[PDB]
């Protein structure tokens, strides 16, 4: 199960 | 025995040959179970092990939506780093990203991971306390400050210590036949004359699982680490692993050498001697 929050560098 | 779950993501820019290439893979211990490739036709997360194959459509749809979303974040990230290092738009660059969780013999959280690399070198990493960050340079300090203000570490910690571990255990149970299997190595030695007064003794370990193993040679019970040729542990292609160790012996001294094997699937460590 992959994480569902997507931060940016 | 201890277990782990890991996600590995690779993004590669191709200046002027369309958008960047993005490849995602997921593993449970040493068994791969899913993949995503931006160049493929499906455009979906896909099964790579038989045990995950009957998760229903809601699982597949959710994993596909999440992996697409990660793809797009990496498309923006490649431009951002290009600005942070003031690089041209003509070179090809690589971004890598990993995250995971380890659980112990009791299946309890032991450790969590999350880190990035740019063109093969460490860029930013979450520390073991799951509250601090390690920034490799000036560009990475800028990312760190951003992530600190937005409280990104708190969000990662709830996934790594919670969700990650829950799904790892669920996978361990559902794929038990494959994943909770312990396969002891099949061992044997070969002997081959290289000259009239020397010979090569090779010690083999085959069809074992999981990958971790210790394989060494001794002369009269003493360590021979600098005179042993050790190959890297490798995949057989069928879910099992292989490894060998060799030493060049003076003819007449075969009996002084012992090959030592250690692995989870063995009741007691093994000691072999050509004779």
């Amino acid at each position: 199960f992959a994480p569902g929050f997507f931060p940016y560098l | 025995g201890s277990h782990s779950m890991r996600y590995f993501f690779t993004s590669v820019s191709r200046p002027g040959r369309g958008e960047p290439r993005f490849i995602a893979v997921g593993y449970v211990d040493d068994t791969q179970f899913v993949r995503f490739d931006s160049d493929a036709a499906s455009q979906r997360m896909e099964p790579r092990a038989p045990w995950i194959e009957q998760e229903g459509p809601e699982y597949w749809d959710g994993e596909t939506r999440k992996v697409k979303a990660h793809s797009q974040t990496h498309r923006v990230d490649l431009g951002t780093l290009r600005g942070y290092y003031n690089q041209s738009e003509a070179g090809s660059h690589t971004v890598q990203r990993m995250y995971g969780c380890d659980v112990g013999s009791d299946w309890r959280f032991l450790r969590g991971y999350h880190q990035y690399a740019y063109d093969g070198k460490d860029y930013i990493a979450l520390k073991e306390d799951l509250r601090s960050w390690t920034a490799a340079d000036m560009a990475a300090q800028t990312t760190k400050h951003k992530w600190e203000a937005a409280h990104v570490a708190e969000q990662l910690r709830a996934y790594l210590e919670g969700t990650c571990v829950e799904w790892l255990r669920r996978y361990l149970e559902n794929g038990k036949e494959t994943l909770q299997r312990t396969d002891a190595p099949k061992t044997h030695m070969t002997h081959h004359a290289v000259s009239d007064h020397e010979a090569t003794l090779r010690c083999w370990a085959l069809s074992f699982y999981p990958a971790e193993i210790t394989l060494t040679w001794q002369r009269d019970g003493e360590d021979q680490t600098q005179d042993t040729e050790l190959v890297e542990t490798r995949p057989a292609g069928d879910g099992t692993f292989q490894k060998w160790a060799a030493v060049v012996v003076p003819s007449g001294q075969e009996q002084r050498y012992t090959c030592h094997v250690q692995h989870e699937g063995l009741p007691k460590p093994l000691t072999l001697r050509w004779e």
């Binding site: - | 590995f8 893979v25 490739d37 990993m98 093969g120 070198k121 490798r234 995949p235 292989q242 060998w244």
Partner: protein
């Protein structure tokens, strides 16, 4: 740019036995960046039905891949793995040896 040279191992899935089906593997690892050309050869000629695992990497960020094909070993036939990468001036060729 960082650049790391691929380690190459050419081998079979099961211990070779003349006349019995098996799979010939070429495992490439420890390399960077990710573009690489990998071919399997039968008596000098490039085999066409070759598959590979999905790109992945180790904790030190270096890459690894598995290339493989179905084959039936014979006393006479010779096999090899040929690899090309930015770190190599010429294509590196490693011959299959049944005790390796």
């Amino acid at each position: 740019m960082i650049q790391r040279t691929p380690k190459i191992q050419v081998y079979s899935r099961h211990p070779a036995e003349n006349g019995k089906s098996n799979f010939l593997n070429c495992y490439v690892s420890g390399f960077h960046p990710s573009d690489i050309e990998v071919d399997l050869l039968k008596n000098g000629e490039r085999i066409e039905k070759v598959e590979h695992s999905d790109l992945s990497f180790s904790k030190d960020w270096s890459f690894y891949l598995l290339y493989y094909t179905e084959f039936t070993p014979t006393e006479k036939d010779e096999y090899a793995c040929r690899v090309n990468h930015v770190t190599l001036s010429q294509p590196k060729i490693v011959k299959w040896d049944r005790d390796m």
